[PDB]
Amino acid sequence: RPLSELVERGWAAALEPVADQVAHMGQFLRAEIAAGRRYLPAGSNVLRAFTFPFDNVRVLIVGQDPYPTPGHAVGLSFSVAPDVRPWPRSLANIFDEYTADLGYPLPSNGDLTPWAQRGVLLLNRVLTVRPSNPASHRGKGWEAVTECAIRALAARAAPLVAILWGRDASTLKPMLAAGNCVAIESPHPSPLSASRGFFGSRPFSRANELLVGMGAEPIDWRLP
Ligand SMILES: NC1=NC(=O)NC(=O)C1
Numbered sequence: 001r002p003l004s005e006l007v008e009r010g011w012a013a014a015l016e017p018v019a020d021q022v023a024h025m026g027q028f029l030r031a032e033i034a035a036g037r038r039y040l041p042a043g044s045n046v047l048r049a050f051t052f053p054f055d056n057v058r059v060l061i062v063g064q065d066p067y068p069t070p071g072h073a074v075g076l077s078f079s080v081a082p083d084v085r086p087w088p089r090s091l092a093n094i095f096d097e098y099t100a101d102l103g104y105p106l107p108s109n110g111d112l113t114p115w116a117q118r119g120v121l122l123l124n125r126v127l128t129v130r131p132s133n134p135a136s137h138r139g140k141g142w143e144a145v146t147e148c149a150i151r152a153l154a155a156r157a158a159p160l161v162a163i164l165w166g167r168d169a170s171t172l173k174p175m176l177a178a179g180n181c182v183a184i185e186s187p188h189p190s191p192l193s194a195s196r197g198f199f200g201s202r203p204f205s206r207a208n209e210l211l212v213g214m215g216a217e218p219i220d221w222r223l224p
């Protein structure tokens, strides 16, 4: 199916340079199934981050690979379905920072869809994984797709704040360099850094200070 059927209109235009590579990745996933290997998230969720409007993205959160445990990955980085419990460790850590940074009560569930609906792009650099095999689809072709996405956001006239929660943070920074109104949060602790740099990093409040300083609306980070 063409991009226009898979992703939101603005994203379909932004991702046109990787249209053939996206189709190629569809073929890779089919071949995995044919080879007797599984992948996560579900096929219908692989491109889910790009189903919210490109034009309203104001914050980019970048992870590395999807959750490797069956029933966790849902196509938005770090998110889980609202009936998943206990939360994965990374997400529990994210929520302990959420409460500290913002002063909001602990969320009821792990669904980050409200962030996506408000202009937060919950991107992983690699969009699929073989279950129980962490980082197993590294180098299989997603990187050109997600790089295209990142560079497209940075080329927009609009403000953008980037939060780098993956191992490749240092490879990602240059992709964000050309954007005139792009601010990248540094340093780059990841959720599992926990009290050795992640807690107290204030990613949500800092994003909003930066957006407001650039004349953009803040993100409402509140979760139920
Ligand atoms: N634990 C996780 N690490 C990531 O980098 N991304 C995810 O979606 C989940």
Ligand SMILES: [Cl-]
Pocket (backbone or CB within 6 Å): 088, 089, 090, 091
């Ligand atoms: Cl985790």
